[PDB]
Amino acid sequence: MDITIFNEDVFAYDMDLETVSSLIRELKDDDPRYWQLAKALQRSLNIYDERDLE
Amino acid sequence: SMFLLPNQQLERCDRVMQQRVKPHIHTTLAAC
Amino acid sequence: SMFLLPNQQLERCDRVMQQRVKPHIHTTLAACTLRSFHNPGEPVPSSEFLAKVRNGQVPFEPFRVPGVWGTTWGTTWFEVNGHIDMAAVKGRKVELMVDLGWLDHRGPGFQSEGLVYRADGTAIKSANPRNHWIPLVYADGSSTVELDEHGDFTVYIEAAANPFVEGPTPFSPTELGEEATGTCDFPYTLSRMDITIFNEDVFAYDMDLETVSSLIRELKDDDPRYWQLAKALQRSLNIYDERDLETVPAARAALAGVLAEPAASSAINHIAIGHAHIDSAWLWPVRETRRKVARTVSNVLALMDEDPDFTYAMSSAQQYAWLEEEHPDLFARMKRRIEEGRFIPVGGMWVESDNMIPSGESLVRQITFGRRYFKEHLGVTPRGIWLPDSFGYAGSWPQIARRAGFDWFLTQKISWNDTTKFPHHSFMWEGIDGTRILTHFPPSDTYCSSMSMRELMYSQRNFLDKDLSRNAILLYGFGDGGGGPTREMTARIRRDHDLAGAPKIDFGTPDQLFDRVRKDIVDDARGETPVFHGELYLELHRGTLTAQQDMKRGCRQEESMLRVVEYLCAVASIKNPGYVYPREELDRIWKTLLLNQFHDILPGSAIAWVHRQAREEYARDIAHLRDIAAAAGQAVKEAEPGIATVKHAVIAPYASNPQYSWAVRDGGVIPVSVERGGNAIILDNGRLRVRIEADGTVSSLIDLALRRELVPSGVRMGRYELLKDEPFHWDAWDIQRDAFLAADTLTDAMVEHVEDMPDGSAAIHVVTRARGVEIHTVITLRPGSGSLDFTADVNWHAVEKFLKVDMPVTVQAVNAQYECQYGLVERPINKNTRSDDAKFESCTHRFVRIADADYAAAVVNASTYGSDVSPIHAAAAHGAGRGTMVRLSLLSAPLYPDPRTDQGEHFFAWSLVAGAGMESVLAEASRLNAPIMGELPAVRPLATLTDVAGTPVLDWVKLADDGSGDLIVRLYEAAGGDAKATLRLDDTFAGCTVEEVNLMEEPVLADDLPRALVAGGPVPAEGASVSFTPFQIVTLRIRR
Amino acid sequence: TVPAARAALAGVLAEPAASSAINHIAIGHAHIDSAWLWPVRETRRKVARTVSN
Amino acid sequence: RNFLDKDLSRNAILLYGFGDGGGGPTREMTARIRRDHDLAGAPKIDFGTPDQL
Amino acid sequence: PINKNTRSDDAKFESCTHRFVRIADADYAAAVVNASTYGSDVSPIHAAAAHGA
Amino acid sequence: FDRVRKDIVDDARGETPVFHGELYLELHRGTLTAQQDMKRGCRQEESMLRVVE
Ligand SMILES: [Zn+2]
Ligand SMILES: [Zn+2]
């Protein structure tokens, strides 16, 4: 139980990742949206680094 | 160039939320 | 009348087991008194502590029925006093129902455990998370414990509190497996512990309900068996009542009407084997695996005491030796049970080690040590290899296994692939040469199975070879580091003998199953025998080859140390009499080097304890071996005075000159010239012209002897790359395809002063810096040679990174040549299909060769075991940017098993050879991977090969392990072409006889083996001719 | 070559079925319609053909 | 597969023979019935009468 | 490939040849030079013999 | 094809699919040795054209 400051960009990025990942799971394997979302998620995940939040 | 495995990317992303991106939403500064 | 809903009956039955029938199996009758004595330190052997208690020197404090007792990596002794009374439990079993307070969703074998020792000192059983009953009084009068005058007894539980290494989130960094801190971190809470009586009919009814319910779930909705089973379950569930237990017989009979129908005569005849894989050191130290194996043996013996028609298996004779040394009674009981034929010791290897990384000499040492131990301690000879958990299998294994006497092979980890599925589950694995060995896979794809019916039919469904085999193996028993078979699975096996709708399964032995497979797929197909040629390559992990580089470096160093010291000891023994062979200390260095080569130690995945004890043992062994070599050398000099003296005493198995192979040449015309022109440094040694760029990179390595340029003009040699790897499953073991995409090319370096060595060599120093990494790299161009040497000192301090160095060469081909233990292997460079992509990281041994019709280029390694080869087609003109790139993996930074991995200074060395002939590559690799000694006397080579026709090579020279003084030589071929040679000894080995023997060193040979001699009888050892088939292995014994 | 081939195929044609199947009973039946697409003078011919067959 | 009462009956009827106005049993089906007396993987079928069923 | 390992490798059991087929190892090679045929097949042989003959 | 070049060459920047070797059809395979006279004559006239040219 401690005083904390809130980060907005990190929360927005987390929510976007959650939305994309949840949309990928339920789609079929015969839809270009599935592959496009998977490729976008792979591209995005290779840039985010927790050692520097910029 | 390597092939794409969406079922592996899903698990990687799930781990990313579980361990990496969730703790970085609130930054502590003191105690009460 | 109402309709039937099977999906509702299933949930009703599930609730019935969860709430109603489970608690009515054990009926409590009294309570026992507990006292505790704690120890937060290194455990005392149980033999001494029980004797001390018997005499009486240790106090005991009262312990309440509830409460906490645990301590991080600590031990405790619970003295337990009961008050069981006879004359009222006649004919009924009595148990203990010990509950240390295990967690639910953690795992069966990764928590606090403990044996229940008798007052005298013997062991009764162990308290496991899934097996927590101790047999006190059997139904038929017999009592394991000794009862006193007025009905009371006492036992001693040796509780060990092992904290769970894994943290809150999966694969999280935890500072638990570092030391034995005496603080409350994960304290266990004790639970109910009382004397209970066992009910048999209730347990049988529960097991029948479980079998029926599990069979209903997996069946389809279009099978009358499904509806019949659902109706039978509904009928049976309406009769059983928990308010009065006399209704059980009236309900079992109703349910048994559909439990006696024979199955269809087309199912797979499974054979069930009890197996419990105790890992020697993964998450616990080497001092805890002894306790774990003792618990496993005690549990297996206790279960087998009451239940006939049971089988079990146990490999890793290391554990057999530990059990014999520390538990005479357990070993005696195990040996007594072996005579009956229900405790089959399977697996002739000394310990379940890795395959890809260890050298072939280590493999043969394990095989011979384990076979000798089994032969002369247990009087049983194994027939096959038993390796149910390993990462990748070398192609040389079939040949060694067949020449060692084994005749079948069993593995299961290949099914853990990521992209492709193995074509067969029972086939003939063909070695690199010609050697075919029968291989079988467990269809269930698990060595630790709970014998669930779902798994039972999954094994049948996943069987690819369903058309000509009709036979499969199934290993059952909570394992993966602790456990062993329980009553539940041994009841399921008996219930499922010939149950309709499920595959038929019975007890048996591995030999019977393998004979059945041989009859089915060899002697009956008559031309339809499945065959798999090449090597078994696991498609998972792949990051283990370059994790904890210190372990692999030390292992290579001590392997070379053993080779040199054994040669020196053999020379000392054969030169002058009175020199006792250091057999004892040699076998002490062995069985410890070989122990440290475990499948969860050598690749590196464990807590800091294992990776620290391994380092300390490596250093101690190296020092002791150097001392032994110095003593043997001093002994040799006493045979006759004033022979010679050699500085640095470099000994190499192979050399460019055939007569200089096992020479004693020391370790230390055209001096190298440097032409500092422009923004580059140009060297000239008369055969190579290397142009080092501004910042520690090579842009040209022109071969002046052939006017050939082998550096593509799209990239620069020697560049260091820092790939970011963040694995999500099996962090230390595995590296994913995430790397090789987010590559980071280091571009912060500057050359240093170029130095001309006093001997004549030329060296260029350079420093490279990164976020938390610094590298001091020296490039050496030795005069009068054709190899460019690279040495590096790294100060790794980063987290979650991966260091690589690339050595591109313009030679273009399709397949790259790595080397296996005793041969070579071809692997594709340009990955075409899906399955070809998964082989993006493979193990390498001391060199990688890329060859075309005439020209070949090699990258000879010193201490790294991983690399990757990829084609390069960059942007250039006139086709100047086409070639191949071989990136050597230096080291990674795993975080889960060890919070700090590879911190400090690391030393790397390698070289590049142009015009790479096989003999030249072998000679230079031998030069690089050779120990540097001090001052030992110079002696002539013991055995030489003068009429070489091909590429023969001396691999090992030693003495006879039987004490006869016989000389032993081990030879192999390392190119692929046939070889013919003549062996010559020196002086004292005149009028001798040389005979071909197997790898076991005994003089018995098979028939299908090619053989190397001319007749087979004793041939004089002067001008003896040896013939080689592609990648042959030959062992020769020479008398006095 | 027919006898040498029937025996090889008959090895998997004599295994008893699982003791859970439905015991079907087969009845020969030819439904003859009195008058659908033909006059009442043709159903006599049709039933005669059926009985003769 | 289409039998709803599969839990308490274990009995079914099957009429064979070309019908819908013309036909009657031929040699092919009366051979199939004999071949499928107790064939594994298929339901058991035998000759009989409606009264017995 | 000569020894077909996987499913896809088996399908390449007959391939076109032009005027020769060469099987080579480190040093020694043997060739079957053709004149007018455009098809062949290569398969390993491990027969029943002694001393690996 | 310009669209494909833009999509998979100038945009992937290192993710371009590549297939090395030869495209081998896994069907037919009997055409290589059918009507041998045609292939024999074709080889003969190819040599004839070479020499005559
Ligand atoms: Zn293991
Ligand atoms: Zn009608």
UniProtKB/TrEMBL annotation, chain C:
Span of domain Glycoside hydrolase family 38 central: 539-618
SUPFAM superfamilies in UniProt: Families 57/38 glycoside transferase middle domain, Galactose mutarotase-like, Glycoside hydrolase/deacetylase
Gene3D superfamilies associated with the record: Glycoside hydrolase 38, N terminal domain, Glycoside hydrolase family 38, central domain, Golgi alpha-mannosidase II, domain 4
InterPro entries found in the cross-reference section: Ams1-like_N, Gal_mutarotase_sf_dom, GH38_C, Glyco_hydro/deAcase_b/a-brl, Glyco_hydro_38_C, Glyco_hydro_38_cen, Glyco_hydro_38_cen_sf, Glyco_hydro_38_N
One Gene Ontology term of the molecular function aspect: metal ion binding
One GO BP: oligosaccharide catabolic process
Tagged with keyword Transcription regulation: no
Record keywords: Glycosidase, Hydrolase, Metal-binding
Pfam family, one: Glyco_hydro_38C
Keyword Metal-binding tagged: yes
Family according to the record: Belongs to the glycosyl hydrolase 38 family.
Protein name, as recorded: Alpha-mannosidase
Species in which this protein is naturally found: Bifidobacterium longum
TrEMBL record, chain F:
Family label: Belongs to the glycosyl hydrolase 38 family.
Protein's UniProt name: Alpha-mannosidase
Organism of this sequence: Bifidobacterium longum
Species classification: Bacteria, Bacillati, Actinomycetota, Actinomycetes, Bifidobacteriales
From TrEMBL, chain G:
The protein, known as: Alpha-mannosidase
Residue numbers of the full-length protein present here: 513 to 565 of 1046
Protein family (similarity comment): Belongs to the glycosyl hydrolase 38 family.
